[PDB]
Short mmCIF file of C-alpha atoms in Angstrom, two decimals:
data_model
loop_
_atom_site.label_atom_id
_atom_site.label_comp_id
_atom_site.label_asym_id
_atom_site.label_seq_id
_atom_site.Cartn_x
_atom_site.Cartn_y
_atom_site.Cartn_z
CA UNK A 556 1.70 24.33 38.19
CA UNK A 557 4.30 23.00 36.21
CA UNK A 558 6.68 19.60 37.25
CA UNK A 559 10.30 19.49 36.13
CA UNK A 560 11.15 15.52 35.49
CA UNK A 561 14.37 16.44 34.30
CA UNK A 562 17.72 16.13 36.35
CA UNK A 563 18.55 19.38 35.39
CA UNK A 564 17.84 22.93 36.05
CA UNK A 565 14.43 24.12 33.86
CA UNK A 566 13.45 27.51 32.51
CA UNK A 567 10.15 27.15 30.47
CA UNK A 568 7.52 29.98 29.65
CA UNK A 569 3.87 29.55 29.30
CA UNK A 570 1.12 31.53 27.71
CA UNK A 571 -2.58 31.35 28.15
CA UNK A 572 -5.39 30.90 25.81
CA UNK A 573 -9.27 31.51 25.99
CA UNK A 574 -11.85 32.76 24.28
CA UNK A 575 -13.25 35.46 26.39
CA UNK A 576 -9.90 35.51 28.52
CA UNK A 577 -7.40 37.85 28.00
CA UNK A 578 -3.82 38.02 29.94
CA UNK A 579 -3.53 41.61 31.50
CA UNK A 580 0.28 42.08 30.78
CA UNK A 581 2.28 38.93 29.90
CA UNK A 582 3.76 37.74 26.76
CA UNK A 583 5.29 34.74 27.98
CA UNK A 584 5.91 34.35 32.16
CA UNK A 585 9.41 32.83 32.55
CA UNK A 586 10.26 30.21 35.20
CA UNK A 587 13.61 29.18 36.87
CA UNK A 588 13.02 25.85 38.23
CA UNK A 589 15.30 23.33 39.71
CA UNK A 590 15.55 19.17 38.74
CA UNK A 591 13.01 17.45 39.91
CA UNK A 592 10.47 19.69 41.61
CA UNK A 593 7.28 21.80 40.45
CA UNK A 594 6.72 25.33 40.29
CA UNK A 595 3.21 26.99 41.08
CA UNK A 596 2.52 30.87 39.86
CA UNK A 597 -0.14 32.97 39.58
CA UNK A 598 -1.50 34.80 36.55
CA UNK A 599 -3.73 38.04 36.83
CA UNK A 600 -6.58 37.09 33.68
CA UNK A 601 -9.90 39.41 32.95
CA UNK A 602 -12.57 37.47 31.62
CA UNK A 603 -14.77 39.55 29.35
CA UNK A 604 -18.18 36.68 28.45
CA UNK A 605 -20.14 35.04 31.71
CA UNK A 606 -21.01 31.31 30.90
CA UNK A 607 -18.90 27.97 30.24
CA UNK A 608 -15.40 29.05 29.44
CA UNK A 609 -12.56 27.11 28.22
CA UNK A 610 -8.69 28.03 29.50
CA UNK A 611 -5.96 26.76 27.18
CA UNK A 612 -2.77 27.12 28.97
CA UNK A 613 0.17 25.77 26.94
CA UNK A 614 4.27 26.01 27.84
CA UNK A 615 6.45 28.09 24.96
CA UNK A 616 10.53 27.54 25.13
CA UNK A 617 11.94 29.48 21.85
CA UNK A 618 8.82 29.85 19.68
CA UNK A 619 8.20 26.25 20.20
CA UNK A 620 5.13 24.71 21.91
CA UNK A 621 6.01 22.34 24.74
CA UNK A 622 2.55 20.90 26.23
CA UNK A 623 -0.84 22.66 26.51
CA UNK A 624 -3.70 21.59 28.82
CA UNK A 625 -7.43 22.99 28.44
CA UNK A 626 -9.14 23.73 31.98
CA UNK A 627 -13.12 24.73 32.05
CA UNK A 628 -14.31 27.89 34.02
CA UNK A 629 -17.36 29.15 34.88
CA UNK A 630 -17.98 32.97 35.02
CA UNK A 631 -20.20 34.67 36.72
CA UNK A 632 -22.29 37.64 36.26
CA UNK A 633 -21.29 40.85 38.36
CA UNK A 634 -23.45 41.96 40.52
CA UNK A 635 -23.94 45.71 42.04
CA UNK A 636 -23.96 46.80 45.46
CA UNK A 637 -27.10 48.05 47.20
CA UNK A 638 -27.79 51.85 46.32
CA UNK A 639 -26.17 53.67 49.76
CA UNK A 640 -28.40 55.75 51.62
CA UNK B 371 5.60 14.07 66.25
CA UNK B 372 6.89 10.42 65.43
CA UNK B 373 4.75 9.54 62.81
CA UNK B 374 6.16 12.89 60.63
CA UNK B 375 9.35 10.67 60.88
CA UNK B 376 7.65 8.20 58.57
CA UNK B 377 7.10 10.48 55.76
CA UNK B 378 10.59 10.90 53.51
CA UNK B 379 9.88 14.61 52.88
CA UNK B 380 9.51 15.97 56.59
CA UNK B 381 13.15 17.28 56.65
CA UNK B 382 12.77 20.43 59.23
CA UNK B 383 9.59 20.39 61.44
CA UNK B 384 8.51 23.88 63.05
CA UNK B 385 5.77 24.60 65.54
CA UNK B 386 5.00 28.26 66.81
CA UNK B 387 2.68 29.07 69.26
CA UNK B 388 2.23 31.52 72.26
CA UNK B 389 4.14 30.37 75.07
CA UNK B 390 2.07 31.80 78.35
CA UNK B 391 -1.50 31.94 76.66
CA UNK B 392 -1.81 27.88 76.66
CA UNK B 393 -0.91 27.28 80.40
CA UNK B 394 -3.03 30.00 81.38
CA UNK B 395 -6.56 29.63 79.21
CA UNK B 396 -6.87 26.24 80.40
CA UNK B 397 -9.84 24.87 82.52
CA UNK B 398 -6.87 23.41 85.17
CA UNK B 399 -4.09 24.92 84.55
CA UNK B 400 -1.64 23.71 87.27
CA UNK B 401 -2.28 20.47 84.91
CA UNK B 402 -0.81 21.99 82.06
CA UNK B 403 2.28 22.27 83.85
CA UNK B 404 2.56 18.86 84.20
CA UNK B 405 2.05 18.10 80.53
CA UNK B 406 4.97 20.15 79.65
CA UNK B 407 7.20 18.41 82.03
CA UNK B 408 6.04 15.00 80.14
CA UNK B 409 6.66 16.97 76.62
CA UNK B 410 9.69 17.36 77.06
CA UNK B 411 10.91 14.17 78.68
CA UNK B 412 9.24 12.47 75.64
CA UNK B 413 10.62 14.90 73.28
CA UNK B 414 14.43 13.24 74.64
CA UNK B 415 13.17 10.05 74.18
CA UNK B 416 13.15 10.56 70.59
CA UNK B 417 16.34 13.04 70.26
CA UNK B 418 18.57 10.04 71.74
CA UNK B 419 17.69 7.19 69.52
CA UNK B 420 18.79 9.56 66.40
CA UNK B 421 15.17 10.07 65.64
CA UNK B 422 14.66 13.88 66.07
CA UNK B 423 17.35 16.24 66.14
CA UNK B 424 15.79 18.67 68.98
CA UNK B 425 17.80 22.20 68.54
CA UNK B 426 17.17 25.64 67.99
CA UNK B 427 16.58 27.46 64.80
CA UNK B 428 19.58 29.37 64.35
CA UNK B 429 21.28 26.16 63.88
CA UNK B 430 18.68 25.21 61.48
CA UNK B 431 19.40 28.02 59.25
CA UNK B 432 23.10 27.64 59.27
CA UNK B 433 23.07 23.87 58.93
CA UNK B 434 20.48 23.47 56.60
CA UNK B 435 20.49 26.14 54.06
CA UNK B 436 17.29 26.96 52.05
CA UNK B 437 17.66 25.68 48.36
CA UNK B 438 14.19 26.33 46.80
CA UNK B 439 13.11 30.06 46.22
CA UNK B 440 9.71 31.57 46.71
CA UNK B 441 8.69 34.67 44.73
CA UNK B 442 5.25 35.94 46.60
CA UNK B 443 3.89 35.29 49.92
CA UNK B 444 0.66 37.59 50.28
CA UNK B 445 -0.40 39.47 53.21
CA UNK B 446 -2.14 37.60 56.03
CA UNK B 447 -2.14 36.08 59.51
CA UNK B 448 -2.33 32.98 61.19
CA UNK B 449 -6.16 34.38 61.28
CA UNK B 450 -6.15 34.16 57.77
CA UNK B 451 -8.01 37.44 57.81
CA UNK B 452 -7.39 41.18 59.39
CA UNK B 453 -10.76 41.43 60.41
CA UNK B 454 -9.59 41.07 64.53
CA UNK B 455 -8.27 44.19 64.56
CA UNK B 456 -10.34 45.92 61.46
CA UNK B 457 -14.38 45.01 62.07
CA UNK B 458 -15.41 43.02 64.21
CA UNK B 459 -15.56 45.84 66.73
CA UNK B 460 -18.29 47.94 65.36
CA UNK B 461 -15.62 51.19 66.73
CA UNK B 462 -12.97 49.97 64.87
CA UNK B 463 -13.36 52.18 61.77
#
């Protein structure tokens, strides 16, 4: 989620940053957002460790980093199904 | 309905809902008919004083067109699941 305190129309890009995590196909997601007003997405990640992990997500506008804020996920192990009969 | 008056950010309200299923799943329901009748006297009582603006939605969408733009909506129902009409029937499969 990302909030626009500007009085003018916003198009940022963010990219994502872990140390197990890995972003399936995205370089940098572009917004279009309008003045003062947030803007949710959703980004498809794979995590590839199970344990503490720690999500750096920062905002990119022309090579330039805008803000970056670390989140903390826990992954868990995958289990199998029951062997079918 | 009033008190969503209060709040600044309210600026369409919508409510959906079958329209026999509630006067006829009710333990009385000659009473329900009754409650509508009070419904919608109330419901002038706040139209009149320039509270609500009771009207229908195609004048909604003309008069109030929609500014903000939403990319995804995923699949669901007002279940929240598909599992009504896919498994909890064991013949559904």
């Amino acid at each position: 989620t990302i909030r626009n305190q500007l009085e003018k129309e916003i198009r940022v890009s963010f990219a994502i940053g872990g140390t197990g995590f890995s972003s399936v196909n995205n370089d940098l997601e572009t917004v279009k957002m309008n003045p003062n007003s947030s803007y949710t997405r959703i980004i498809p990640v794979k995590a590839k460790f199970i344990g503490k992990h720690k999500m750096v997500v920062s905002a990119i506008s022309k090579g330039l980093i805008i803000d970056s804020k670390i989140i903390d996920i826990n992954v868990k192990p995958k289990l199998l199904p029951n062997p079918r009969l | 309905v009033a008190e969503k008056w209060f709040d600044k950010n309210v600026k369409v309200l919508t409510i959906a809902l079958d329209g026999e299923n509630w006067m006829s799943f009710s333990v009385n329901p000659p009473l329900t008919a009754y409650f509508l009748d009070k419904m919608i006297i109330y419901l002038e009582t706040l139209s009149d004083n320039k509270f609500i603006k009771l009207s229908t939605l195609r004048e909604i969408y003309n008069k109030v067109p929609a500014n903000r733009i939403l990319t995804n909506i995923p699949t669901n129902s007002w279940l929240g699941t598909f599992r009504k009409w896919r498994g909890e029937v064991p013949q559904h499969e």
